[PDB]
Design a binder for this molecule. Structure first.
Ligand SMILES: [Zn+2]
Length: 43
């Protein structure tokens, strides 16, 4: 977590830089992907 760590989306797969991905969790490119992976799946 310094320069621009990559955060891959478990839902869509899209990968980006922490400062570009959802700061909330960072695991998903969007909050929807969070409520979706949670309300539609489990890990
Ligand atoms: Zn996504």
């Amino acid at each position: 977590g310094s320069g621009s760590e990559p955060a891959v989306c478990e839902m869509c797969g899209i990968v980006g830089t922490r400062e570009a991905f959802f700061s909330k969790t960072k695991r998903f490119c969007s909050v929807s992907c969070s409520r979706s992976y949670s309300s539609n799946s489990k890990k």
